[PDB]
Design a protein around this ligand. Structure first.
Ligand SMILES: N#Cc1cnn2c(O)c(Cc3ccccc3)c(Cl)nc12
Ligand SMILES: N#Cc1cnn2c(O)c(Cc3ccccc3)c(Cl)nc12
Ligand SMILES: [K+]
Ligand SMILES: [K+]
Ligand SMILES: [K+]
Ligand SMILES: [K+]
Lengths: 209, 209
């Protein structure tokens, strides 16, 4: 209980309402009601702080804020600077995923605690293949979602390594890929979609019923 | 000209209308108007033959039919048995992809002719990772679409090898993966979606405007 700090990424499609509520507030509330969660560090343009700020006394978590940066990793880093000095786990979530299930958050938190780093994923349904520089097929794949859950010292070491040795950040689990620590893939739900265009918004409404 | 035989897979979501026309007819017509295409072998439950049969004298291709089988590869094989004895290329298409562009069909036909086997693909947008049996991340991916275009002798040899040596067919390019022949990935369009649920159907309508 109160061992997890959520970094909620909300640096605009994550504020378009879903049944009257901005998309970013759904996951915000899902996390707030979990007794595991001590605090939520919201990463957002200060223009939208109000959207979250209205609910501070009514939620049972500490609310903090962080300034976004140029790339997703910069926004992750900024949020990381604000967590309780004794948080055992950081839980990084894309606010564009409003429909994440509490049960799946529970699973990835559990796996993150056990393993050190964990991320929600689902089996990739489509035929997906590695392709080389000459456009030829190179002769189980999982699609990643969020939360991404990691022990703060682990993530700090990852940022430290990328920084000092000047490494290339390419995708959403690139930083830990440079470390030798294992990353567990917690099996999630296909309903935990990223809601970035009006067609997704419609999906979200059907899932919400 | 008249060098390509299309195997149109329509073995029910591919007959739900899109702006009044069953989904399966969109690609059917796209292929019919191409002077490269000699014939279309439609693979469908005979219950729906009429849907295609109505247009035979008005299209400029020979129309043939084949019975589906249990798995997609069986349906591919059945269609293969019906093509002109002198077709230089077979063009396999999932009728659930109604929005394929003529220009992209032209590209994959060109690449299939040059290389021997080619398939439309797009860069996979999501973070996708290989995961091992212990649920851990294994430390460019492309999403495949159709058409899949192949020289008929190449595809026949592939079915022959899988059959005689009893190999496991897993995904949509599995059969050729056993051969040493290269498979080219022709860059397609994100609009060439597979339309399997009412939300896709809505996507299709927006793309169609
Ligand atoms: N942006 C961004 C980004 C790039 N890499 N990377 C990363 O490795 C983690 C850490 C992490 C990875 C997997 C599972 C949990 C945590 C997080 Cl949270 N973000 C990023
Ligand atoms: N079902 C099914 C199926 C499984 N494998 N496989 C395959 O290799 C090809 C041939 C092909 C592959 C890549 C590019 C063109 C053709 C086709 Cl057409 N279908 C299948
Ligand atoms: K380590
Ligand atoms: K999407
Ligand atoms: K060969
Ligand atoms: K779909």
């Amino acid at each position: 209980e109160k061992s997890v700090s959520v970094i909620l990424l909300a640096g605009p499609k994550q504020y378009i309402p879903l049944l009257g509520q901005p998309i970013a507030l759904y996951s915000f509330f899902t996390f707030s009601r979990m007794p595991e969660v001590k605090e939520i560090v919201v990463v957002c343009d200060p223009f939208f702080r109000d959207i979250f700020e209205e609910y501070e006394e009514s939620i049972d978590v500490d609310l903090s804020f962080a300034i976004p940066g140029k790339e997703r990793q910069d926004s992750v880093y900024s949020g990381l600077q604000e967590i309780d000095v004794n948080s055992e786990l950081v839980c990084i979530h894309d606010s564009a995923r409003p429909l994440v299930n509490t049960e799946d958050v529970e699973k990835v938190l559990k796996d993150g605690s056990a393993v050190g780093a964990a991320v929600l994923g689902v089996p990739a349904k489509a035929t997906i293949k590695e392709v080389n520089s000459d456009s030829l097929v190179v002769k189980t794949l999982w699609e990643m979602q969020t939360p991404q859950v990691i022990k703060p010292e682990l993530l700090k070491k990852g940022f430290e390594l990328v920084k000092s040795e000047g490494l290339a950040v390419t995708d959403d689990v690139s930083i830990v890929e440079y470390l030798k620590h294992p990353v567990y893939v917690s099996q999630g739900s296909y309903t935990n979609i990223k809601v970035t265009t009006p067609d997704d918004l419609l999906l979200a409404e059907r899932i919400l019923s």
